[PDB]
Amino acid sequence: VEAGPWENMAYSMDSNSINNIDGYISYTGWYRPYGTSQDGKTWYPTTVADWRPILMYVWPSKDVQAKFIQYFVNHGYENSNYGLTTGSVKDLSENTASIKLNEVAQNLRYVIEQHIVAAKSTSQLANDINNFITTIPELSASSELPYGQVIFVNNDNTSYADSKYRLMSRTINNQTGNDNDNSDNGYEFLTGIDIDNSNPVVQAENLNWEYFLLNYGKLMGYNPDGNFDGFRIDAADHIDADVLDQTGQLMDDMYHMKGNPQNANNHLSYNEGYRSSAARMLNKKGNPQLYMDYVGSTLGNVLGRANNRDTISNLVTGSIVNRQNDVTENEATPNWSYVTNHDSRANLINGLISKDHPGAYKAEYANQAWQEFYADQKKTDKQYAQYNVPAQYAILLSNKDTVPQIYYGDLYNETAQYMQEKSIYYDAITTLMKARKQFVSGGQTMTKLSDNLIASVRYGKGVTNANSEGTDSLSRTSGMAVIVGNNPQMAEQTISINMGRAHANEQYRNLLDTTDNGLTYNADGAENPETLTTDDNGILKVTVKGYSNPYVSGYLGVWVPVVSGNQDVTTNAATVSADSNKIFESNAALDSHMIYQDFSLYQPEPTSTENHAYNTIAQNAELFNNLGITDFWMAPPYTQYSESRYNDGYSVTDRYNLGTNANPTKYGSGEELANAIAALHSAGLKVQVDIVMNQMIGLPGQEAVTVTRADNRGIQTYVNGKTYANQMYFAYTTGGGNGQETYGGKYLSELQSKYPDLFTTRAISTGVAPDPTTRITKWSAKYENGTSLQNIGIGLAVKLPNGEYAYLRSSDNKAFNTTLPETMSSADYYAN
Ligand SMILES: [Ca+2]
Numbered sequence: 001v002e003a004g005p006w007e008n009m010a011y012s013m014d015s016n017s018i019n020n021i022d023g024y025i026s027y028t029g030w031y032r033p034y035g036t037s038q039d040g041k042t043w044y045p046t047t048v049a050d051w052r053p054i055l056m057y058v059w060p061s062k063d064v065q066a067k068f069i070q071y072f073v074n075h076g077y078e079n080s081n082y083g084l085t086t087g088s089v090k091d092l093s094e095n096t097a098s099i100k101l102n103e104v105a106q107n108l109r110y111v112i113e114q115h116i117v118a119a120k121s122t123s124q125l126a127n128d129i130n131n132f133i134t135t136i137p138e139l140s141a142s143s144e145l146p147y148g149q150v151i152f153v154n155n156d157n158t159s160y161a162d163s164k165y166r167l168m169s170r171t172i173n174n175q176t177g178n179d180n181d182n183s184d185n186g187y188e189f190l191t192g193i194d195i196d197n198s199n200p201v202v203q204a205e206n207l208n209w210e211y212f213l214l215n216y217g218k219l220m221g222y223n224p225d226g227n228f229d230g231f232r233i234d235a236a237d238h239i240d241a242d243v244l245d246q247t248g249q250l251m252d253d254m255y256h257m258k259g260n261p262q263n264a265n266n267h268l269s270y271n272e273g274y275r276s277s278a279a280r281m282l283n284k285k286g287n288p289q290l291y292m293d294y295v296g297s298t299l300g301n302v303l304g305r306a307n308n309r310d311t312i313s314n315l316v317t318g319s320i321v322n323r324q325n326d327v328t329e330n331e332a333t334p335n336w337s338y339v340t341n342h343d344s345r346a347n348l349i350n351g352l353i354s355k356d357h358p359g360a361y362k363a364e365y366a367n368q369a370w371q372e373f374y375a376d377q378k379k380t381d382k383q384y385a386q387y388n389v390p391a392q393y394a395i396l397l398s399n400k401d402t403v404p405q406i407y408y409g410d411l412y413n414e415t416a417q418y419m420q421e422k423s424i425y426y427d428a429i430t431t432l433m434k435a436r437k438q439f440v441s442g443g444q445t446m447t448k449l450s451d452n453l454i455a456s457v458r459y460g461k462g463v464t465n466a467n468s469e470g471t472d473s474l475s476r477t478s479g480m481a482v483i484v485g486n487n488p489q490m491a492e493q494t495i496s497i498n499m500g501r502a503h504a505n506e507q508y509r510n511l512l513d514t515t516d517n518g519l520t521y522n523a524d525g526a527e528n529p530e531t532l533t534t535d536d537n538g539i540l541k542v543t544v545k546g547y548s549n550p551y552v553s554g555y556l557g558v559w560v561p562v563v564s565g566n567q568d569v570t571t572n573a574a575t576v577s578a579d580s581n582k583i584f585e586s587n588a589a590l591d592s593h594m595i596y597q598d599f600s601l602y603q604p605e606p607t608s609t610e611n612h613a614y615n616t617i618a619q620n621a622e623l624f625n626n627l628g629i630t631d632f633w634m635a636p637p638y639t640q641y642s643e644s645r646y647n648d649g650y651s652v653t654d655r656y657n658l659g660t661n662a663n664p665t666k667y668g669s670g671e672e673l674a675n676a677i678a679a680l681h682s683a684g685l686k687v688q689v690d691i692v693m694n695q696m697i698g699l700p701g702q703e704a705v706t707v708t709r710a711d712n713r714g715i716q717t718y719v720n721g722k723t724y725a726n727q728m729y730f731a732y733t734t735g736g737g738n739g740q741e742t743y744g745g746k747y748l749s750e751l752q753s754k755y756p757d758l759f760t761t762r763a764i765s766t767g768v769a770p771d772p773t774t775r776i777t778k779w780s781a782k783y784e785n786g787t788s789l790q791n792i793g794i795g796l797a798v799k800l801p802n803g804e805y806a807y808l809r810s811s812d813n814k815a816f817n818t819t820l821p822e823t824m825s826s827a828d829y830y831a832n
Pocket of ligand 1 (some may be wrong): 188189190195238239240697
């Protein structure tokens with residue numbers, strides 16, 4: 001026939017006329033029909049401008065088709081001349097004859113075309129669709145059942161996304177797939193596209209990625225000494241612990257760390273974690289990385305609270321190391337400790353944001369918490385911020401068997417431009433850091449005096465416990481006493497600290513004491529004079545009382561020997577270990593190191609090239625060495641998701657583009673990074689990169705992927721009594737940038753040549769070696785465990801009445817034959 005409803009057929013049976021992701025078609029998708037009509041008599045051919053929503057021509061079921069009609073007629077498109085009234089359509093439903101809902105929808109379709117001409121656009125239509133969709137449970141976004149994640153699963157419709165692997169929650173001691181520890185060993189999913197670190201190809205891409213970072217400058221042709229020396233492993237509790245093994249193996253191979261504590265300690269690496277099960281996990285592996293200890297919280301609870309504080313003695317037991325008389329080496333779990341870090345600050349400011357604007361909408365100018373925080377930090381009665389900040393760093397920096405980590409935002413006002421403003425705790429913390437390098441070595445003993453007052457003593461270099469004679473030149477004139485109370489109204493009393501028997505009749509300097517206004521570094525207006533002297537057994541009598549001021553809620557006194565000039569107690573590493581199965585060993589040579597975290601989530605965008613963190617770091621390279629920082633923890637340098645909240649580096653889109661001149665990150669360019677590392681190497685520090693293996697966030701590319709609602713362990717769960725499995729999901733899963741395309745897998749050939757064991761050593765969790773035979777030049781579902789929910793929904797993929805998916809063949813998409821809804825494809829259909 002010359003004209004008719006056959007012109008509902010798509011203009012062309014290809015992507016030029018039909019919206020598809022990977023051949024698959026949506027109920028929110030659009031297409032170009034050959035023709036359209038407003039009455040049924042007169043049919044006009046479309047131009048390339050004339051597309052229409054599929055959901056006028058095709059439905060998941062006859063029910064949705066009935067509610068489509070009823071909805072549209074009640075929301076504007078009634079017309080009695082075409083048999084469409086709220087009354088003529090009232091009793092339609094799933095049991096209505098197919099032929100009748102077809103007929104009525106064809107009529108509804110004419111009125112929609114009348115509406116479109118009356119408005120000269122398809123804009124109101126589009127709106128009315130989106131609005132209708134939200135009234136249908138199976139079409140609206142809430143069908144994906146918030147809040148959590150899906151996992152990607154094998155399915156023949158999406159076979160390009162299949163994996164034999166996706167071994168999930170092989171985390172910490174669960175690596176071996178047999179969770180029998182009766183304890184907390186982490187889970188796979190945090191947020192964003194979760195990366196499958198059990199996949200052997202991805203495991204090899206990780207070794208490629210790490211090799212790039214350890215040679216960044218040289219490979220990029222920037223500063224040929226701008227290369228990272230180790231790793232801060234992000235989300236260590238939330239990835240296949242195979243990579244933790246395989247990273248230690250890389251480093252040992254490249255840098256021969258197993259035999260030499262010297263090599264090992266020049267290539268420091270530390271795992272982020274909040275679960276003590278990691279200690280045991282690393283111990284069993286010979287400690288290829290440091291374990292993040294939890295004394296940070298012991299401190300905050302004992303010293304930081306308003307007033308509801310744990311007894312002082314908690315500082316002795318509240319750690320992976322008991323320090324009540326720690327007078328041995330190589331026994332403790334090699335660890336890194338902290339007073340504060342980026343995430344600990346964020347959780348204070350957030351929350352203080354939930355009282356400014358009530359758990360409502362952060363995506364706005366709720367800053368003011370900072371103005372309000374800074375204002376609180378100066379008070380004596382702090383409503384929010386941590387109390388005894390200096391007392392917390394005093395304990396941290398005098399503790400044996402740890403590598404302490406300093407937080408950028410404690411030395412500086414973090415929301416100001418990078419390093420423009422010193423904090424009110426700068427003088428106090430930098431004084432303690434500098435004292436650490438001059439004085440802290442030997443055994444440790446923490447003795448509780450009265451009720452709320454402890455004394456932490458370090459005996460000196462080569463003074464192994466309170467009874468040692470001392471063995472080093474620096475023994476006599478080293479060691480430190482850190483007196484700490486946590487009760488503002490503690491009474492006046494004289495106490496006695498055993499400084500060690502190596503310290504009989506020795507003069508001691510009042511490095512830091514407590515005044516009414518705050519702190520003094522000159523014994524000025526404190527409880528004690530500038531010098532005090534021990535007796536013949538090493539006991540030092542000291543006066544103490546409680547105080548209440550911006551810096552001290554309780555007491556803080558620090559004593560060290562009188563020295564005739566500058567001295568450095570740091571013990572050098574041996575060129576041979578006393579175990580050689582161990583990578584890292586907790587001894588005086590490890591305790592000579594001190595980590596610095598160089599960033600905050602709330603760090604601002606740089607206002608000028610000079611204000612770039614990489615440039616400001618480079619110019620202050622010698623300040624960090626002066627402070628005693630040996631190891632520099634750089635923020636993740638990767639390209640970020642443009643709509644990320646903090647632009648911090650954890651929401652990565654390109655693992656290999658660390659910034660350009662034209663386009664830097666928050667911290668700057670790559671050339672500028674290479675520069676800053678060269679600067680830090682010249683000042684004598686080693687530097688580690690924050691490596692992010694768990695998630696990628698904001699990948700631009702859509703893919704048709706098969707999914708199953710799951711909890712954070714990656715196991716299917718129910719939300720309010722509902723779940724789904726094996727559902728189609730049009731998810732943002734594909735990307736990596738031009739860096740992943742250029743550098744991804746680029747060095748695997750070189751790696752296999754120099755270090756073959758990397759790809760012959762079978763991973764614990766899979767029993768398979770990492771696989772260098774495939775380069776990852778672009779991330780997709782196949783290398784991913786899944787995603788947090790993307791607010792798109794589960795019932796959009798188009799199934800034809802016979803139950804199969806509608807599919808459109810298209811050059812890249814040849815997994816099936818083209819099979820399309822009759823209404824938009826079948827000349828035969830329309831012929832009757
Ligand atoms: Ca993960």
